[PDB]
Write a protein that binds this ligand. Structure first.
Ligand SMILES: Nc1nc2c(ncn2[C@@H]2O[C@H](COP(=O)(O)OP(N)(=O)O)[C@@H](O)[C@H]2O)c(=O)[nH]1
Lengths: 165, 246
């Protein structure tokens, strides 16, 4: 009864699909086998004795499709911009999405920056500091997430639902 | 609807069709008039003292029935009905009939792990059925079937190559390929017509998501150049020439 359109932005391999499947089905490919695609989902959540229903829109992350994205994020009440903490190039890309939504998305959009694959230790290349700093400077919140271990998956969607104008 | 109780519903729908010619064709107004007529007849289905025993699904079917009847009458005045839509159609057809001859899945970032060996033939065929129907619903259903088929085929590829579930990153590039290979006639007018004339209460949810996918596919395809399908400018232009000769 609060109906939200939520877009997932970020480049291929970041973990947009893994994130939303953890959130929706509570599965990760390595533990449960694959059942359904992850491009579109409806999900309801209880927030503060109310109800918030998410329509979740995946987008193609490849460079050649970048200029298509505004058609997807048009009228989005919220966005999760995902990056892979082990890929510095994914982080750079996530900041451009933020900049773009600020030039060209809704000012009352709740953006969340998700730093995915937190569970990967010897691979990590992006600091909590930079992500956190970046998000603090640009009016959005940063969370570290993991689809595999489930860390901060439910919570990032909860925190988005909480902040809904 | 032929039953004698429905006499005055029938008169009403028909005085609408006759009263539609009374204005010079204009898409933005025309479709506004039809959506309002739909909004109003549909209000008259549920609220009607005779139709107060109907299930939600039955009232929804009657909506689609009205849509179909009305849109079939209005079809030639409202569909691809001016020069600029005709021109955009032909530009899209031209580009696809050329590009379909040399495009490969790697031009669109389709990974070998998500390859289908029919080249998603059944999804191509579902899409090409689009000009077999006149109602926006049945046109949209072709798009939606195409999408479902693509998704089931992608899921199969992921199972086989032990990959994670497909998302927009896998789906959209495959919708683009499939659309190019299908080259469905009057794709631009077909989409505009669905957008305008489909019962607006129904262009929502998953339906609207996959619709937005095909609209973004149309847009990508219109704008295909060497750089957008990752080919050298000389390789691209030379591929286009050989396509024209066939
Ligand atoms: N270790 C780890 N791997 C992940 C995580 N999230 C996604 N992955 C993996 O990284 C790959 C890309 O994920 P995917 O969700 O397909 O990316 P996309 N293209 O953004 O949807 C997949 O193999 C997936 O299993 C995570 O939190 N931890």
């Amino acid at each position: 009864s609060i109906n939200a359109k939520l877009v997932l932005l970020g480049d291929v391999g970041a973990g947009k699909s893994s994130l939303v499947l953890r959130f929706v089905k509570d599965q990760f490919v390595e533990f449960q086998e694959s059942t359904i695609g992850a491009a579109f989902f409806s999900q309801t959540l209880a927030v503060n004795d109310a109800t918030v229903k998410f329509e979740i829109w995946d987008t193609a992350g490849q460079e050649r499709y970048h200029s298509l994205a505004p058609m997807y994020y048009r009228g989005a009440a919220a966005a999760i911009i995902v990056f892979d903490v082990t890929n510095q190039a994914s982080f750079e890309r996530a900041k451009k999405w933020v900049q773009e939504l600020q030039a060209q998305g809704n000012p009352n959009m709740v953006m969340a920056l998700a730093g995915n694959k937190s569970d990967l230790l010897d691979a990590r290349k992006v600091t909590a500091e930079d992500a956190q700093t970046y998000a603090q400077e640009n009016g959005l919140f940063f969370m570290e997430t993991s689809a595999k271990t489930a860390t901060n998956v439910k919570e990032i969607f909860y925190e988005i639902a909480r902040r809904l104008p | 609807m032929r039953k004698p109780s429905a006499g005055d519903f029938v008169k009403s729908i028909k005085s609408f069709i006759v009263s539609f010619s009374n204005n010079a064709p204009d898409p933005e107004k025309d479709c506004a008039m039809v959506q309002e007529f739909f909004s109003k007849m549909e209000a008259a289905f549920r609220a009607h003292p005779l139709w107060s025993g109907c299930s939600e699904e039955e009232l929804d079917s009657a909506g689609d029935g009205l849509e179909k009847y009305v849109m079939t009458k209005l079809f030639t005045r409202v569909f691809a009905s001016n020069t600029e839509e005709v021109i955009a159609d032909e530009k899209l057809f031209q580009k696809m009939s050329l590009v379909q001859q040399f495009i490969s899945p790697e031009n669109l970032d389709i990974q070998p792990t998500f390859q289908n060996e029919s080249s998603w033939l059944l999804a191509q065929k579902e899409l090409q059925k689009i000009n077999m129907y006149k109602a926006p619903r049945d046109k949209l259903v072709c798009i939606l079937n195409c999408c479902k088929v693509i998704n089931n085929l992608l899921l199969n590829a992921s199972i086989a190559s032990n990959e994670n579930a497909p998302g927009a990153d896998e789906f959209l590039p495959v919708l683009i390929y499939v659309t190019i290979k299908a080259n469905p006639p009057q794709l631009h007018s077909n989409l505009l017509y669905i957008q305008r004339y489909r019962r607006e209460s129904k262009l929502v949810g998953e339906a609207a998501y996959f619709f937005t996918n095909i609209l973004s596919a149309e847009s990508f395809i219109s704008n295909i150049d060497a750089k957008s399908i990752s080919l050298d400018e000389a390789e691209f232009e030379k591929n286009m020439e050989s396509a024209r000769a066939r």
